[PDB]
Design a protein around this nucleic acid. Structure first.
Ligand SMILES: N[C@@H]1CCN(c2c(F)cc3c(=O)c(C(=O)O)cn(C4CC4)c3c2Cl)C1
Ligand SMILES: N[C@@H]1CCN(c2c(F)cc3c(=O)c(C(=O)O)cn(C4CC4)c3c2Cl)C1
Lengths: 196, 432, 433, 198
DNA sequence: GACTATGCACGTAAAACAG
DNA sequence: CTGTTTTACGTGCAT
DNA sequence: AGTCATTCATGACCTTGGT
DNA sequence: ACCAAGGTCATGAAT
């Protein structure tokens, strides 16, 4: 199901959202020296439960390691978060070094884009402050890891906008990431949302 | 380069914040609708859907591409739901064939279904017409959107879980609350409890639940009769007839307890889920944030928040009247010098030079001059000689009337009563 | 009751008739489009989605195609649509999408949830004159809107896209010209402009194409370089077929070794005709509102005559609209003369209706004459039109003669159609291949 | 996958088009004293091929009989034909008596329907939107899209086939000749040729 | 949001046919 | 193990 | 055109837990 | 086989 490979030199194994993205990546692989993801909340069930998950297990299949540059592309979809959230938790509570090393991290998709001239052809990563640098012409807005050849504007350059994870985590953070994601016991979560 | 790095103490806090604030698209204490609703009810409106049945793919499509980023069958799937009269009180959209069985009945894709907006349904969208409810931009920034329809019908307590009721109890109360703002004991007199489309035990319980924001009980519509040849026959006609139809037959497979003692039915009814139910955990979003409410808060926030809705109705309409009566009051006064102006405009030069040049003859205004300069040669019939005259006091009466609704705290309510009473008829839910 | 009965000698004849007449929704010799196309290209139009404007989603565009002009189910509709996105399947893509069109390889495109697209420039061509009563137009199925029965089409999409082999707008117009000024034409001289069909993705079978062009059927051939790899070895690899089964067919050859930067070049000759690495033209569609087989000369044939009725309609209306304009003008001018009397006449006249009638006097003006006068709107009582309108009488009158000329002149007519088709050969101008 | 049953008294086993129809029938069974169909061209492959077809096989499963009132509802879709065509051929070249008896036949869906008064109900219906349609401005008309849309469903359902068709009636021989000229698919040349009355 | 079967033709590139 | 008829595989637009 | 898996709470209803 | 902590299943709206 992945998108082939080559040499274990710099590793490189990107995870995309939904067969559409992972399709747009696989055919657009302007940078594969891919694997669709349709992800359980690690800390949410039995370890046996978790191995029974095609999603978890798949990720364990590709690249061996086992419980003893792997980048993840989401979108912008607040829905696109929750899918960053689990991945990272599923790379934490399991495959600790993977991140602890920091070889495997999380991608920064694009946002607003400008384009003018009908038939005369002619991007940005924060449609907030960064957007102001860019009437007469025309603007845009990014819907998701959908839409986007282009695709390898985030693709071709070695992660022109990539994010390195876990950097100096440390302890007492495990405390928090099992306050939020995991899904403690209700009371904690309703409660972390006193800064929202 | 490799861009920066960041804590997963960092990344998994800020991400999951985004996703939690998107847990604030829950049913507003006011509209009594969850956005992927509000959007769907308004896409239907905008498009004008009285009229004939519209397909789906088109109605969804349009919902799912001018007012809702997400994918399609989140959009429509939901839609359908609003077709199911055995899930709501007043279905906010009427489809036809095949809505869905009380049993496991997969409804048909957008390929087949066809539906359109419902009467009751209008209620809630019955005054977006003017600058009623407060209104925002699209996601594509293409059209613009309402942030919670203004809603006559208190869909919130008539449909975080909120138990069905009946427009009838709901208006009847709603009235009481108005003229008597400040006990839940007297207020349960109008709504003894929540009505389900498909008898409930737990009086004491509902009673406390209405302020507490609890657990009730639910019993099935099955009676008793005597079958031919001298035998027993006791069978049945927001639960699910899917797992209930099988739970009986399951009881019968082991015989460990239906036109086949009556105490046995009492034991099966509280075991086979044939009369389980229910729960009432009233909870939604108020003040643009998540809170739990009760029977009194709901009517509460809705009465005040509807109050701002009726007042806006005044704000504009009055605005539109004033604007009208000043064009009139203008247009009349014209008649006097109809001959001079019809001569003034000829000589005037270009169109622009003409309205200015209407400095003389009168002290008329731009908006005044406009209509005069666009008065279109037909209407040089002075039919308006006496008529317009009558208008000055016509549009002027409505001007006083609406402005009255703005100053009068007591008269305001009387409007909201007349109207709500009105739906209780037009619509008028039967009891249950 | 049990209603009547009937022969299965009876029922299975009449049913399968229905279904066979629905086998007559095949690509018209003219528009060069199959209905579930024509519908899709016009839904896009009606909705204003030209190359110009911004990308429209899908579900909405399909939705709208699939519910005002196409009974059938959704992904028959769009699925098709996509196709028109694939520039490596057609010559001039009639719709430009973005963001997973489809790989040369097994690449499932994404549902209507994701894709977004809009009408293409070239694409306009074919819809570039529905504007007026060009092509002949019918009702909806729901009887809601109405539909075109085959877009009028500048670009001969039929021979540029029952199977019909791609070509190039350039060969196709170049010929198309020849045919006009020289109707009766051997296929031998006409192949001079189109040596054969162009595929977006070199063909062998000269003799064969040559006979195929009149025969309406036949078989041609299709061919897919060499270099020396470092260290002294061989390196001969590749960059309407399918790169899906070809990419594997090589590797399959290599698994059995029974015959690629990897020692004779004759081996590649043997693999090219075995592994399908370098593996027809059966021209056939619908003419006269019925199914026939055509050739290289019939196609241009029916399209030249059937385009000819298209250019003549363009005249029919536009001229019609001019006349209508010049008579309102010719009216409105004449008004100026008695602007003072009429501006007095209309005042006293009573009701609106009584006013236009009452314009029996002052002039012998007509209803349509009277109308505009009575709706002339008080701004325009600026007599700016005093001299101007005067000029109009000969302006709109010139266009009136011009268009009517296109209607009488058999030779001048063609010259229009040449200028235009030449025009797309530029604007569009497909490179050779 | 069917829609249950009861007593073998009058048989009764309707076949609908697509899970949507067969859904609209199953829940609307105002008349079941059902089975979705997603059908090969019988005479088009090996008899072994045919038994390998979930479609053919299913039909053979429900109601035994084997190669040694079963009504079929289609639509109006010209596409809805081809799906009558195979069914009947698959009830012919196999299960000859089934039809030969004539217990199992083919249904006549509705066409145009009139309805007026917004909120005052008042509807109609008709089975030929040609001549029969003329018997029916002021109000509003309609047109039937397919066995889709349509409670109502049992306007064709509840009454014992108020518009049903009895099949095969006095077939006879020399007709097998023709039904293997058209449907089966013959060898190209025959089919292009039966379409000289079209 | 990608799985899964079929008609409809027309190619021809792969199984099975005999001793 | 040869050459033969038979069999399956693919492709757009529909269910 | 229905198939298939999960988040995200929150319950009442069915699994093992031990000997 | 007792009663108890544990494990499941269903539900809209999103992927
Ligand atoms: N495994 C199964 C056999 C039945 N089936 C179906 C099915 F049942 C329904 C549809 C369908 O509604 C549809 C559309 O109009 O929206 C398009 N398609 C095709 C483009 C995919 C359908 C298919 Cl393949 C395949
Ligand atoms: N592991 C699982 C199997 C099920 N599933 C999917 C999936 F991949 C995508 C969608 C989907 O896009 C969608 C929509 O809004 O258009 C709606 N639904 C649900 C209403 C049916 C989806 C489902 Cl269930 C994948």
């Amino acid at each position: 199901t992945p998108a082939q490979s080559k040499n274990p030199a710099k590793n490189e194994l990107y995870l995309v959202e939904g067969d559409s993205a992972g399709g747009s990546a696989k055919q657009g692989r302007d940078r594969k020296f891919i694997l669709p993801l349709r992800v359980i909340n690690t800390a949410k069930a039995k370890m046996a439960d978790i191995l029974k998950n095609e999603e978890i297990n798949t990720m364990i299949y590709t690249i061996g390691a086992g419980v003893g540059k792997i980048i993840i592309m989401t979108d912008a979809d607040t829905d696109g978060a929750h899918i960053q959230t689990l991945l990272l938790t599923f790379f934490y509570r399991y495959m600790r070094p993977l991140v602890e090393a920091g070889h495997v991290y999380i991608a920064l998709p694009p946002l607003y884009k400008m384009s003018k001239g009908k038939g005369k052809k002619e991007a940005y990563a924060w449609t907030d402050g960064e957007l102001e640098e860019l009437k007469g012409a025309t603007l845009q807005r990014y819907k998701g890891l959908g839409e986007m050849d282009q695709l390898w504007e985030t693709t071709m350059n070695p992660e022109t906008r990539t994010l390195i994870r876990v950097t100096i985590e440390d302890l007492a953070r495990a405390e928090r990431r099992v306050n939020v994601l995991m899904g403690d016991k209700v009371e904690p979560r309703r409660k972390w949302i006193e800064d929202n | 380069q490799n861009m920066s790095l960041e804590d997963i103490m960092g990344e998994r806090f800020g991400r999951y914040s985004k996703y939690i604030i998107q847990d604030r698209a829950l049913p507003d204490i006011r509209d009594g609708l969850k956005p992927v609703q509000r959007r769907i009810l308004y896409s239907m409106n905008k498009d004008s859907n009285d009229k004939s049945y519209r397909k789906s793919a088109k109605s969804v499509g349009n919902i799912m591409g001018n007012f809702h980023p997400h994918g399609d069958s989140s959009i429509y799937d939901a839609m359908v739901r609003m077709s199911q009269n055995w899930k709501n009180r007043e279905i906010l959209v009427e489809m036809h064939g095949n809505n869905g069985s009380m049993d496991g009945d997969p409804p048909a894709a957008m390929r087949y279904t066809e539906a359109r907006l419902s009467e009751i349904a209008g209620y809630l969208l019955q005054d977006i017409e003017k600058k009623t409810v407060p209104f925002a931009w699209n996601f594509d920034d293409t059209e613009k959107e309402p942030t919670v329809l203004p809603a006559a019908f208190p869909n919130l307590l008539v449909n975080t879980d909120i138990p069905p009721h009946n427009l009838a109890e709901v208006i009847d109360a709603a009235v009481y609350m108005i003229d008597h703002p400040t006990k839940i004991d007297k207020l349960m007199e109008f709504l003894p409890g929540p009505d389900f489309p498909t008898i409930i035990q737990g009086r004491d319980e509902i009673k406390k639940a209405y302020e507490t924001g609890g657990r009730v009980v639910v019993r099935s519509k099955t009676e008793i009769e005597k079958l031919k040849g001298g035998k027993e026959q006791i069978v049945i006609t927001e639960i699910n007839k899917a797992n209930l139809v099988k739970k009986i037959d399951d009881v019968r497979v082991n015989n460990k307890v239906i036109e086949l003692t009556e105490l046995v039915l009492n034991y099966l009814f509280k075991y086979t889920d044939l009369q389980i139910n229910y729960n009432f955990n009233m909870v939604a979003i108020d003040n643009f944030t998540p809170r739990q409410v009760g029977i009194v808060p709901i009517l509460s926030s809705y009465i005040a928040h509807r109050r701002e809705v009726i007042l806006a109705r005044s704000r504009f309409d009055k605005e539109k009247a004033e604007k009208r009566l000043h064009i009139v009051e203008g247009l009349i006064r014209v008649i006097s010098i109809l001959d001079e102006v019809i001569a003034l405009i000829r000589a005037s030069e270009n169109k622009a030079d003409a309205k200015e040049n209407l400095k003389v003859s009168y002290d008329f205004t731009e908006e005044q001059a406009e209509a005069i300069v666009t008065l279109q040669l037909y209407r040089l019939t002075n039919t308006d000689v006496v008529v317009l005259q009558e208008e000055e006091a016509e549009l002027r009466e409505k001007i006083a009337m609406l402005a009255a609704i703005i100053g009068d705290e007591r008269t305001m309510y009387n409007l909201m009563k007349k109207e709500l009473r009105e739906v209780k008829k037009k619509f008028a839910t039967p009891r249950l």
